Amino acid sequence: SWLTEEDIRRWESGTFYDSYRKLGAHPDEEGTWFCVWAPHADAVSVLGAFNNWDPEAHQLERYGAGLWAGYVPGALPGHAYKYRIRHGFYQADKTDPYAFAMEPPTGSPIEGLASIITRLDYTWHDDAWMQRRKGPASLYEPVSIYEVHLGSWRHKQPGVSFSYREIAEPLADYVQDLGFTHVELLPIMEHPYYGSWGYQVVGYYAPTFRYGTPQDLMYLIDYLHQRGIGVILDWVPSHFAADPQGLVYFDGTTLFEYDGTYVFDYNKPGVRNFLISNALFWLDYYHVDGLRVDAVASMLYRENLEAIDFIKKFNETVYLHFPEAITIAEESTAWPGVSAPTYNNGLGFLYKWNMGWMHDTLDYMRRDPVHRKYHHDTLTFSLWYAFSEHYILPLSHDEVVHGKGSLWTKMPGDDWQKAANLRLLYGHMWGHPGKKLLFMGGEFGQHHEWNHDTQLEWHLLDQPYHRGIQAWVRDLNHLYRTHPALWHDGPEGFEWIDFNDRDQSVICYLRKHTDRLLLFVLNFTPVPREHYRVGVPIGGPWREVLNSDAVAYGGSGMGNFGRVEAVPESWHGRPFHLELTLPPLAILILEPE
Amino acid sequence: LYRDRENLEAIDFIKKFNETVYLHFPEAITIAEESTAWPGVSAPTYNNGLGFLYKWNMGWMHDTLDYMRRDPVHRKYHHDTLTFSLWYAFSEHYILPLSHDEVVHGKGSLWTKMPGDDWQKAANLRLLYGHMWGHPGKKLLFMGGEFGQHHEWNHDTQLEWHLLDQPYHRGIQAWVRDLNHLYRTHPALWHDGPEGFEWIDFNDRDQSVICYLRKHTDRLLLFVLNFTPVPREHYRVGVPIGGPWREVLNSDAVAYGGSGMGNFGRVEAVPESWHGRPFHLELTLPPLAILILEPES
Amino acid sequence: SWLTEEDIRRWESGTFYDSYRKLGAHPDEEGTWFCVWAPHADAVSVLGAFNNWDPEAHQLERYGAGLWAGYVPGALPGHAYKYRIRHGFYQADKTDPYAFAMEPPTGSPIEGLASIITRLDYTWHDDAWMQRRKGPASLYEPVSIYEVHLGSWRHKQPGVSFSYREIAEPLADYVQDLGFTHVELLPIMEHPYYGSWGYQVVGYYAPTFRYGTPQDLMYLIDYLHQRGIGVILDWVPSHFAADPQGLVYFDGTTLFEYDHPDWGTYVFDYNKPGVRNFLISNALFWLDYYHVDGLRVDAVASMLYRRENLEAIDFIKKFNETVYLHFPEAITIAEESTAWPGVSAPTYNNGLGFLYKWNMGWMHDTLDYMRRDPVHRKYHHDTLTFSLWYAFSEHYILPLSHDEVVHGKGSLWTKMPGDDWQKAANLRLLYGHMWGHPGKKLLFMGGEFGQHHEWNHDTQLEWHLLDQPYHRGIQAWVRDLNHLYRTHPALWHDGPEGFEWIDFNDRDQSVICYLRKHTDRLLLFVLNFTPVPREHYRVGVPIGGPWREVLNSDAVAYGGSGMGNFGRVEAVPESWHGRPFHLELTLPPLAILILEPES
């Protein structure tokens, strides 16, 4: 009775995307129901304090499609349970793959993690955000994603991360103040080794205990939503974690594995429901706004059609049940049409990480400003590849770790020059077509690499240069969210003005939607330039709306203060030109009055 | 007044100071600040008062500052500090004062005093000015508070006018301007007697929201205040009169540095009883924001 | 089915304000129904003569919300009964919190107090009074309260008090001749220690046995009402008595207690709905079953704090909200010794919802001023005059309670300075000013003679002093003041509009002149606080023409020297005290003159 016929036959068929509704521990006030998928298991038993851990007190009965299910009177929420599965001669104790919450019995996860019976009752208040949230339509809207690892963000006391509920107000305040639209959280699903950052996952249906209850995660997502903030969750369907007690050789054979050793067998229908139910599980039960699949490349190549067809059906299923969700992919092999609809033969994502832009932008800016003349093309040629896909410009945790160095460390020269370069890099990324992702700590230009066992170097927010960079990004986001010329990342919305100044390493382009136009002039050299002429389409009065070199950001204060007037003689093939003074290592944004 | 206790010399001098002033210059104004709860500072000498026209409401200042200095998560537990301010607002003719003495000696700027990051700090400062203009009594703001300058007032230097270039502070200055324009034009705010104030609701302590009315004759102004960064939707507020109501001011308007969240006007009172009132308004409360609403004529 | 399902649903809500209808012991001719609230009980049983005090004879059945009920055939009125509650390993015998009458089995309250099954059937004859009671409308009518402890008032013989009935005609006789408007009774609810004065309460629903049966008390109130006198009952929701069989640890754990420095662990847990039912139902119980006109809550500050206690503040607000809903013309008075605002203000304006507040600020200032010698009063003039800055902050009752005449504080008489004449003069002056000052009047028994000794509850008041002149004069003065109060509406309106200053700056001569007004009527009060007669003392007045002397404290009939204007005072149109016309008067020693324009 626990299972309908439509459940079993949906399971068989690879289509049970509600499987979480039936699989795992489902609490009832008298007792908890248990359901496990173990097709090659001869026996399955649920164990717990609720029956003195007796392998024979409660042994789930076998139903079809390799599913087992049984009801245990006296198993209550918070009771730790375990699966004792027998395969021929050998028995093994295993986690619940569908466990909704897990906890380390010894207080140390590397040693433990046990499945915990849990009720997921929660009363939401985010209705307004969810009938307004915009998924695919977000292509024509500002998307500023702040990348966050919760444990490393801030600590209530040294070595202690903020609770889910505890971090709710500080994170929203910060995100709001700096004007980011969403947060992207490194995977919160349960993982034994904190040092993995969450990418080696044991419990795909359980939020990591370290920050609190499953309901705690709902409060945070609920809280951020009411403050008008979006939450993107990192998702790791490419591989499961190397845990003996978990998904490895589960029923006794290869099951989640392929019939190295920990990539999911997409050929199996059971694996397909497990993952694709997990995609909807987060979008549904935790109101997640976006999923982000990393290392799609490893899923793509061995071509793995089983995996490519899974990735297409993954995206299709998501948008069918959640039309205003977002799916983002990181792909490194330049596979065509990641952000393209499946009906055009695409993977079906809404977005793709433009890591092509990231390398070019990073490589160009570690060069000393002197040498930048000789790599002008590396900078200017980013726009030949900027429209192949819906792109998010990305600065990530991977970029700031393993000797890659902090973005401030990457920037060349003296600390004022490094701060100016960082501001110019941020200014170009907002100007450059595509959505913006910035990882925690880059916003104030932190000094070391990301260290996950510590809290960000917030004390650096007393130094003038870093406080200024944080001020530059806030204003960058402020113009971004306001002026729709930056909302449209198509080839339309960008217009070159001048790319030929290699010697002085200067770039001028135009960002436009309909009537609105934005002029970006960028000087990648510490030498200032005055009497610099920049072609413009429109004449008349021109205002300077942002300047890297303003003192509030920590710059020397060289600018074009007085409203810039346009001189009507042709320049850069344009009717009018603006005589301009270019501040050292700075980007100027100009709006016609 | 005291030597530590009463100095009658000083009290009689104070009284005849005030009497001669108003006798020779009937249209002058005399104001006193007194750090005790001495009665009748603003009262006429012939009624045994000291004879001042106005008294600084330092009770209000301390109370208000004490409350908003605290974090929104905690404002729940200090709701009574906010609401009980009006039990003392009609004891004297009062000028709600935030002064140079408040922004000195390690007390911190008004901006510095407010909690959260800069967006929320600016939001709170807009709220403080929002409530002070709503609270009964005349208004005093010390120089530089109108844009929310960071540093304590230093007499050896000039104010941080450069912050008027940054948006958060230029927004606050605009908010004060709009507040003063509302004050100058609406007579509902001119009468600081108990007749000039009516409570709409004060017991939403959990969500830290207060609604009150500033009314002179027929004219009435509705003040709805959300002291939390979460906006509130479908929040109902009782009204005395039913009909179209307009939103005259929104602290959360983008012009002041805000979310841009708001009712958007054309609010029609719903002929449903709420807060013991015949009609009610269904409003959306922006983050850390003040709404001022007028019926439509 | 003893309990309605609505009753259990209302009990869990904390909305059962008639809960006395079902909880406690309710007699039936065959047997008594028993109902007690004990949520943390494994079992509850009724013990009594009706079952050889056997705990297994009659075990109540547990209903919803920790409400236990059972029927006992043969349990009869006047029988003593007891509850046995079992908390796991331990069981204990407890008294009924909802007991309607208690009596000491030994004969001594301090040893044993026992719940007794009672019928409250009583036929009232007070129909006329309650169709006309005021209260909220009494804000503009004279309220003159005679505060009384029944046991201490009068004795039939030394150490033997009057029954509830026996007291009726003497107290009603005395209160009417005095002109007092109400009697405020020190707490009548059952209390073990007589020396507590009743503030350590065990039987909130039971009138004390010392003065008779519950009906005896209803008759007393019924009687007084027919005589046109109101009854205020002191009530103690702040704390309960420390009696082991009492409310303490009722079900074997914390129940009425919190799960205050004054009475720690004896403070009611206003958080629990069950506590809220018990307290508010009891408030209504007295207004309902005993027709009480008003209830006075003491030490309200002890509830407000521990910093504010919001449990209690919502409780007080709901108490006042509930009372006026079920009894629109009741009166609730509060004594709060902090400067907590809006005690007398309606809950809808963030007030506590009381109708009246004791002006304890006034009492302190006033007593401190008159404790001082007239020679020295010069230097403390502001203590006298400044009472009017705080005199309209609330709807106030001027108070001279028992708390001021105990513990070495001295009788009001003892407090006044000088020889006997000046002591009598000072007290006649004090009351005159108190009757003139804005606010209703409360005087504790024995103050009307200005008795020498502190209030000693173990004895009867010194009525023998009523034979001697000085004390008989003060009794006459209070009666006559009470006549002036009721006759003239100028004193009924304690609003700022009612009072106007005539002069307050005569510090040297220690004199005060003020006006008390309603519309047409004016009453002029001139006070000489020094034993020196003042002659040619001019006092400004609004109206010209003939003025009358309505009262003079110094009349020889009151024990005074007799210097007086004796009426026939004509206003002179010369500006005095910033006023168009002036009166040229004689100010008697340590006396009050009360004058009105002739009509």
* Dihedral sign from CA coordinates of A307, A308, A313, A314: positive
Is B46 close to C389, i.e. CB distance below 8 A?
no
DSSP B132: H
Is A226 close to B230, i.e. CB distance below 8 A?
yes
* Residue B88 contacts C where some CB pair is shorter than 8 Å: yes
DSSP B286: P
Residues facing A27 on adjacent strands: A32
Out of C311, C335, C336, C549, the active site residue is C335
Out of B33, B160, B198, B282, the active site residue is B33
Helix (H, G, I), strand (E, B) or coil at A225: helix
CA distance B207 to chain C (A): 16
Find out whether B219 and B187 touch, Cβ atoms under 8 Å: yes
Find out whether C540 and C579 touch, Cβ atoms under 8 Å: yes
- Residues in chain B with CB shorter than 8 Å from the CB of A228 are 231, 259
Residues in chain B: 297
> What string of H, E and C letters represents the secondary structure of A335-382?
CCCCCCCHHHCCCCCCEEECHHHHHHHHHHHHCCHHHHHHHHHHHHHH
3-state DSSP helix/strand/coil % of chain C, to nearest 5? 30, 25, 45
Name residues whose C-beta falls within 8 Å of residue A244's C-beta, 6 or more positions apart in sequence. none
List C-alpha distances in Å: B129 to A233, A314, A457, B122, B291: 39, 52, 35, 11, 12
A127 to chain B: nearest residue by CA? Answer: B233
Cα–Cα–Cα angle for C551, C554, C558, nearest 5°? 85
Q: How far apart are CA C15 and CA A353, in angstroms?
A: 61
If you search the block for the tokens 């003038």, which residue do you land on? A464
Find out whether B140 and B98 touch, Cβ atoms under 8 Å: yes
Interhelix angle A5-12/A269-285, rounded to 10 degrees, is: 110
Q: In this structure, what token pair is assigned to residue B214? A: 């500033």
Helix (H, G, I), strand (E, B) or coil at A391: strand
Q: In this structure, what token pair is assigned to residue C386? A: 């400044």
Q: How far apart are CA C590 and CA C554, in angstroms?
A: 8
Find out whether C241 and C202 touch, Cβ atoms under 8 Å: yes
CA distance C26 to chain B (A): 39
Find out whether C393 and C173 touch, Cβ atoms under 8 Å: no
- Residues in chain B with CB shorter than 8 Å from the CB of C349 are 199
Judged on CB neighbours under 10 Å (0-12, 13-18, 19+), B83 is: middle
Which is nearest to C509 in space by CA: C470, C469, C486, C538? Answer: C538
Q: How far apart are CA A22 and CA A34, in angstroms?
A: 9
Asked about A294 being catalytic, the answer comes back as yes
Which is nearest to B113 in space by CA: B70, B74, B80? Answer: B70
Judged on CB neighbours under 10 Å (0-12, 13-18, 19+), C269 is: middle
C-alpha distance across the termini of chain B, in Å: 51
Q: How far apart are CA A353 and CA A375, in angstroms?
A: 23
Q: Taking the CB of residue A451, how many other CB atoms lie within 10 A of it?
A: 13
Is B48 close to C501, i.e. CB distance below 8 A?
yes
Q: Which of B48, B80, B83 sits opposite C385 (nearest CB)?
A: B48
Residues facing B110 on adjacent strands: none
Q: In this structure, what token pair is assigned to residue C187? A: 């707490």
Find out whether A66 and A39 touch, Cβ atoms under 8 Å: yes
Q: How far apart are CA C285 and CA C235, in angstroms?
A: 12
Which is nearest to C210 in space by CA: C289, C152, C256, C282? Answer: C152
Find out whether C366 and C359 touch, Cβ atoms under 8 Å: no
Give the CA count within 13 Å in the CB-facing half-sphere of C564.
19
Neighbours of chain B (3+ CB pairs under 8 A): A, C
CA distance A219 to chain B (A): 13
Find out whether A480 and A436 touch, Cβ atoms under 8 Å: yes
List C-alpha distances in Å: C353 to B16, C51, C533: 42, 48, 46
Q: How far apart are CA C391 and CA C389, in angstroms?
A: 6
Q: How far apart are CA C548 and CA C249, in angstroms?
A: 65
Find out whether A555 and A547 touch, Cβ atoms under 8 Å: yes
> Solving technique for this entry?
X-ray
Flag whether B touches C (3+ CB pairs, 8 A cutoff).
Answer: yes
A261: left (phi over 0), alpha (psi -120 to 50) or beta: left
Find out whether B127 and B172 touch, Cβ atoms under 8 Å: no
Out of A7, A216, A251, A330, the active site residue is A330
| Pairing mode of beta strands B54-56, B31-32 | parallel
Q: In this structure, what token pair is assigned to residue B148? A: 């929310």
Q: Taking the CB of residue B106, how many other CB atoms lie within 10 A of it?
A: 5
Q: Taking the CB of residue A203, how many other CB atoms lie within 10 A of it?
A: 27
Q: How far apart are CA A553 and CA A416, in angstroms?
A: 11
Is A169 close to B287, i.e. CB distance below 8 A?
no
C-alpha distance across the termini of chain C, in Å: 70
Secondary structure tally for chain C: helices H, strands E: 14, 29
If you search the block for the tokens 């001042």, which residue do you land on? B52
Find out whether C319 and C354 touch, Cβ atoms under 8 Å: no
- Greatest Cα pair distance, chain A, in angstroms, is 92
DSSP calls for C64-81: GGGEEEEEEET--TT-EE
- Residues in chain A with CB shorter than 8 Å from the CB of B120 are 173, 176-177
Q: Which of B71, B74, B118, B150 to mutate to test the interface with A (most CBs of A within 10 A)?
A: B118
Which residues in C164-184 are b (16+ Cβ under 10 Å) and which e?
bbbbbeebbebbeebbbbbbb
Q: How far apart are CA A341 and CA A316, in angstroms?
A: 9
B233 to chain A: nearest residue by CA? Answer: A128
Asked about A61 being catalytic, the answer comes back as no
Q: In this structure, what token pair is assigned to residue A244? A: 């003996």
A249: left (phi over 0), alpha (psi -120 to 50) or beta: left
Give the CA count within 13 Å in the CB-facing half-sphere of B25.
7
Find out whether C191 and C239 touch, Cβ atoms under 8 Å: no
Sheet holding C546-552, edge to edge: C499-503, C511-518, C521-528, C592-597, C546-552, C569-570
Residue B115: phi and psi, rounded to 5, are -90, 155
Alpha carbon A217 to chain centroid distance? 17
Out of C298, C404, C448, C480, the active site residue is C298
* Residue B278 contacts A where some CB pair is shorter than 8 Å: no
The continuous run of DSSP H or E covering A533 comes out as strand A529-536
Is B230 close to A169, i.e. CB distance below 8 A?
no
Segments in A254-354 forming alpha helices (H): 269-285, 296-300, 305-321
What Rg value do the Cα atoms of chain B yield, rounded?
A: 20
* Dihedral sign from CA coordinates of A26, A27, A30, A31: positive
Q: Taking the CB of residue C502, how many other CB atoms lie within 10 A of it?
A: 20
Find out whether C551 and C523 touch, Cβ atoms under 8 Å: no
Find out whether A151 and A452 touch, Cβ atoms under 8 Å: yes
C379 to chain B: nearest residue by CA? Answer: B6
Neighbours of chain A (3+ CB pairs under 8 A): B
The continuous run of DSSP H or E covering B80 comes out as helix B79-83
B82 to chain C: nearest residue by CA? Answer: C350
Which is nearest to B16 in space by CA: B54, B46, B55, B56? Answer: B46
* Resolution of the experimental model, in Å, one decimal: 2.9
Q: In this structure, what token pair is assigned to residue B130? A: 């929002």
Find out whether A133 and A221 touch, Cβ atoms under 8 Å: no
Find out whether A506 and A523 touch, Cβ atoms under 8 Å: yes
Segments in C372-489 forming alpha helices (H): 374-377, 381-385, 412-415, 420-436, 469-487
Q: How far apart are CA C515 and CA C504, in angstroms?
A: 12
| Pairing mode of beta strands B94-98, B138-141 | parallel
Find out whether C129 and C168 touch, Cβ atoms under 8 Å: no
Which residues in C320-332 are b (16+ Cβ under 10 Å) and which e?
bebbbeebebbbb
B residues 21-60 near C, CB within 8 Å?
39-40, 46-48
Helix (H, G, I), strand (E, B) or coil at B111: helix
Q: In this structure, what token pair is assigned to residue B234? A: 């479908």
Q: Taking the CB of residue A44, how many other CB atoms lie within 10 A of it?
A: 25
Name residues whose C-beta falls within 8 Å of residue C80's C-beta, 6 or more positions apart in sequence. C48, C49, C103, C105, C114, C115, C116
Is B117 close to A176, i.e. CB distance below 8 A?
yes
Residues in chain C: 599
Q: In this structure, what token pair is assigned to residue B171? A: 């927004």
Identity of the residue numbered C126: D
Find out whether A576 and A536 touch, Cβ atoms under 8 Å: yes
Which is nearest to C96 in space by CA: C85, C86, C82, C109? Answer: C82
Q: How far apart are CA C187 and CA B235, in angstroms?
A: 46
List C-alpha distances in Å: C560 to A201, C50, C346, C417, C589: 99, 67, 45, 16, 8
Q: In this structure, what token pair is assigned to residue A106? A: 């010894």
Q: In this structure, what token pair is assigned to residue C244? A: 């082991």
Which is nearest to C319 in space by CA: C280, C264, C285, C261? Answer: C280
Q: In this structure, what token pair is assigned to residue B161? A: 């006018």
Q: Which of C311, C389, C390, C497 to mutate to test the interface with B (most CBs of B within 10 A)?
A: C389
Is C341 close to B87, i.e. CB distance below 8 A?
yes
Q: Taking the CB of residue C500, how many other CB atoms lie within 10 A of it?
A: 14
Which is nearest to A288 in space by CA: A278, A273, A297, A296? Answer: A278
Q: How far apart are CA B230 and CA B259, in angstroms?
A: 11
Find out whether A90 and A84 touch, Cβ atoms under 8 Å: no
The continuous run of DSSP H or E covering B279 comes out as strand B279-285
Out of A294, A389, A498, A501, the active site residue is A294
Q: How far apart are CA A230 and CA A208, in angstroms?
A: 20
* Residue B80 contacts C where some CB pair is shorter than 8 Å: yes
CA distance B243 to chain A (A): 26
DSSP B76: G
What Rg value do the Cα atoms of chain A yield, rounded?
A: 27
Name residues whose C-beta falls within 8 Å of residue A245's C-beta, 6 or more positions apart in sequence. A93, A94, A95, A113
Cα–Cα–Cα angle for A143, A147, A149, nearest 5°? 155
The continuous run of DSSP H or E covering C303 comes out as helix C300-304
- Residues in chain B with CB shorter than 8 Å from the CB of A172 are 229
Q: Taking the CB of residue A239, how many other CB atoms lie within 10 A of it?
A: 17
Residues closing a segment before a gap in chain B (C–N exceeding 2.5 Å):
4
Identity of the residue numbered B246: R
